[PDB]
Symmetry: D2
Subunit: 152 residues, 4 copies
């Protein structure tokens, strides 16, 4: 359904989504440039977005993925993930990664449903990389769950 | 609410619950003996059950926990977990553990809500310890998520 | 070479070894009882010792292993490890574990040489379970390296 | 002691070092370009070399480091690592990574001595990414030990 295409021009409407995932606009711009940003449109409305950054050799990661609140929960999330996997294949990558907070129960499900498997956990991650205490779904988000998926 | 008390007598009604979690009745009997089995009643009806087995030094694990299907989703799950943590405290244990399949999204939430933090993952676990392919919530259950919780 | 046999009687000479690995005599006694303690003699002299404790279901761990300083570095270490693996086999265990501090470079080698593979890391472990700062080989020992080895 | 400076010209003498670490010349060229390659000279002789590749956002990794065999073991190894950490700081990175095979006991020590801490293990890594069986120090190298180090 969703029509996804490459992106090169960032505007307030787009930053709104990218900022839903990564609050720090600074860090966003870093990988937004060094990485590939794709935008998904549903007609004329900006549905969602996701960035593919290249990390370790032969390894690529989804450094950011988001869907407009008024349009999420409709299945666009899964479409983007499954799509990022395809862009990653044509990129010749061997393994694709992505990670979120231990509190993000929903995502922990979604990603796995798209083939991702949990690799390891970066303990105290959010504790040392953030000033305040992040909370979500009655859980203290303080660990970075790392997931991966081999393409072969 | 739920009234939990020690258990020493196993009967079909009880095995029904223990088998909800661990299918293998053999393995169950092993830790059922070497471990402490508690039963929770809601009046005269057998609500749920859970076993506390001692693993590493100063470490105890919830090798099994279940709640009657016709009574689960009412909050008894959380009560048992929170209760097992108390039995574990009086047992002088330093850390308490518990782990489930990566597909068990619901549990991954519950346990964390009771303080548990994800430790590490036992990759391909269910692949080598089971013959068939376990599936749940549209996810291929094949990894053993290990969680823990220090008591101090 | 080393002659290893079951043990049931603890004496100062034996505690000296067990305490080389685990300083806390209290914790030692715990698993010393609940676990199986084997002693290795080289003639009439107490060469070394090791304890096999049963942790998770079908899983056994070497909660302690040591060799008299005046006799270590002669290869008795490896013999005990390889021996504990055999006792573990006859015990019908599926997997055997053992872990040490990230600073224990020597052991990280030894164990792997006996088939052990690194599983996961318990970050900050020694930080929360000990009062002082442990140091060894110019490394700040603060992480618990968990290793395992399937028996099949 | 060692004089380290940026590099842009690759010659047989340099590839000799880079290939000591990563045999695959192909993969080397990939990160050799997308990454920053520094060379360390001890007078007029090419002492060693190391490459800083940028992986995850705010994260940089030492994708390759080596020292001329006839000059290693003199402490140049440590100098390069400690130097890569400084180049990484001025690069504004938050965390720096580096990983080697579980068999590389020597490095497991070196890196830790430079502040690196073991993060997680990529099981069966070398089994699926290499055709032959790698061996070293009487150990079957088949796991990728991942280390990291926060810069703040
Ligand atoms: C993460 C995100 C992109 C994906 O969004 P999404 O639209 O919410 O998720 P989807 O609707 O596409 O998920 C589909 C799965 O979840 C399940 N699901 C749908 N509604 C559900 C509900 N109410 N409760 C539990 N599961 C549900 C479905 O089973 C579906 O799987 P299926 O296709 O196999 O049937 C969106 O939540 C978001 O952008 N959030 C804010 C930013 C963020 O967290 N970014 C990522 C960090 S880098
Ligand atoms: C996993 C298990 C132990 C926990 O049981 P549970 O009672 O079913 O789960 P809970 O009710 O406690 O779960 C919490 C949910 O119920 C809801 N809830 C809590 N109190 C409630 C109440 N008084 N009334 C209605 N709903 C309530 C919450 O909304 C919560 O969901 P949320 O986290 O999304 O907000 C039980 O599901 C089970 O034994 N299942 C099968 C066996 C198995 O797979 N075992 C493996 C472990 S060894
Ligand atoms: C770790 C320990 C169990 C193993 O004992 P060990 O007998 O002393 O060690 P080994 O002799 O088998 O060790 C092999 C090393 O000695 C060297 N060595 C020298 N001569 C040797 C010989 N003739 N045969 C075998 N190794 C020899 C090797 O270089 C080898 O190095 P490597 O491990 O890097 O490969 C023992 O050192 C000990 O108990 N130390 C203190 C307590 C402790 O750390 N306990 C474990 C905590 S759970
Ligand atoms: C990794 C490498 C660059 C560094 O080389 P190096 O010169 O051999 O190592 P160094 O001499 O500089 O190491 C010094 C540290 O290790 C320690 N060390 C020395 N001998 C040791 C031993 N036998 N066992 C454990 N530690 C030892 C020292 O403590 C020293 O630290 P210190 O000064 O604080 O006391 C070199 O080994 C190499 O190029 N190897 C092959 C390629 C490879 O595998 N590269 C990495 C893949 S990413």
């Amino acid at each position: 359904k969703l029509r996804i295409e490459l992106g090169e021009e960032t505007n307030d409407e787009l930053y709104d989504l990218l900022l839903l995932a990564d609050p720090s606009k600074d860090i966003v711009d870093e990988y937004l440039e060094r990485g590939e940003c794709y935008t998904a449109w549903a007609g004329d409305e900006l549905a969602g977005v996701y960035v593919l950054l290249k990390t370790r050799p032969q390894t690529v990661e989804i450094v950011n993925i988001a869907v407009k609140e008024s349009l999420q929960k409709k299945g666009f999330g899964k479409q983007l993930v499954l799509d990022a996997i395809e862009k990653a294949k044509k990129l010749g990558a061997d393994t694709i990664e992505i990670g979120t907070g231990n509190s993000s129960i929903h995502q922990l499900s979604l990603y796995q449903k798209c083939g991702f498997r949990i690799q390891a956990i970066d303990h105290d991650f959010f504790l040392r990389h953030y000033d305040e205490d992040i909370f979500e779904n009655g859980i203290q988000c303080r660990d970075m769950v790392r997931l991966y998926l081999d393409l072969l």
